[model samples]
Target: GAMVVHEPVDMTEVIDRSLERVRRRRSDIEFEVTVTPWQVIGDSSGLGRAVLNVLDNAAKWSPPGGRVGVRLYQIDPGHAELVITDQGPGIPPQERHLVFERFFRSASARSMPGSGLGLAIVKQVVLKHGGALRVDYADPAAQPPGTAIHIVLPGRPM
Candidate 1:
């Protein structure tokens, strides 16, 4: 298992750093981010790694000149959900569940170069911190239905 310091971490910092982390690699892609005030009991770095992975996937798959939406909002006072959206081909819910599996790749993105372990690792991090992760279409009815990754974690009062 990966080492992590679990605590009441300020996720705003984590989100900022992760955004910079991915942007540094894929400057061609546009990021439209909206982070609301929130808190969560989690391993900062582990959560950051997970966020980066999701952002990287979005950036990698996004069409040239496409925009990725990063939305961090409170599901309720006791919970927070981070949704990363990319305007690219989306996975069906049936196959979306397999993204957490080791070495899995989508038929649409088969040509993309990757070991496919990124999201698999993310699942471990979220599960370790008692969070839930899911993949769905960002806008199901859109022309090119994009993908949305929802990482929902339980939060606490500051």
Candidate 2:
């Protein structure tokens, strides 16, 4: 139902920019970013910015000295996957759907510094380019309970 097909993302510069943003925030927060080469038909810049915004949100919600991880992988011949995880209490199942609503900030999340527009914007960007987005509890058995954000996109040549 969508017609806009963006170009392949030249992530070389976007990763550096996103990392720089995280570094400027706090030394206590650590981040690991991993990107694999793949083509996706969409606005690379917009996609990168959306991903970066999510990373920043995770960092802010995370506890001091917590870690955030960003990983990119090819899901298949025409799909690329990007997953971001944070060592922070995750949004409850009931709240997961609202997380992407415009200006939606849960009561508890209100105390945090965000308008909650990040995911809303992320949803818009992905849907516009014929992609999907999801978030869920990251491995409940893990020592530190956290959340994982999943991004799936098609790999189209630039």
Candidate 3:
């Protein structure tokens, strides 16, 4: 619902800032972040909000002292990818497609505290930037397997 002012913004910085906030909120939570310098042409605030939303969701679902893994790197000359994984109950395959729907929360997540708009907004922001987003289970066999979300955004023209 907000306008995005297009410009070159460093995604790594946005992610670092969001991670700082997460660290302040939960000192007990552990996180691993690896990012290569990558810049995307878009509204800095909107892109930052999208990243923050995903990180916040990961933190919310993670158990105390659980691990959250983050990675950002270039996929090609024109695209970059951001991956976030949280040690929490993985989404059911049947409901994976619905996570991006506005106000859509899975049965496993209904007991959690959320309005279910985080991923929806994330999807909107990614799509607005000509990007793609997806989610999958990090480990299918692990008890209470984790969820991994990936986002790919376009980079500046070569």
What TM-score does each of the candidates earn? Answer: 0.93, 0.85, 0.92
Candidate 3 matches the true fold with a TM-score of 0.92
Q: Please write out the lDDT profile of model 1 over residues 1-158, one tens digit for every residue.
A: 55667688887888899999889877988899888867778688888999999999998889888899999888776888989999899887779768889988888663688888999989998998888988889998996798999998888635
Alpha-carbon runs more than 4 Å astray in model 3: 156-158
Error of 2 at 140 (Å): 1.1
Q: Where is model 2 more than 4 Å wrong at Cα?
A: 1-5, 107-110, 156-158
lDDT of 3: 0.85
Q: Candidate 2, residue 54: CA error in Å?
A: 0.5
Per-residue lDDT value at 42 in model 2: 64
* Model 1 lDDT at residue 132: 91
Candidate scoring better on TM-score of 1 and 2: 1
Model 1 scores a TM of: 0.93
In model 1, what lDDT does residue 10 have?
A: 83
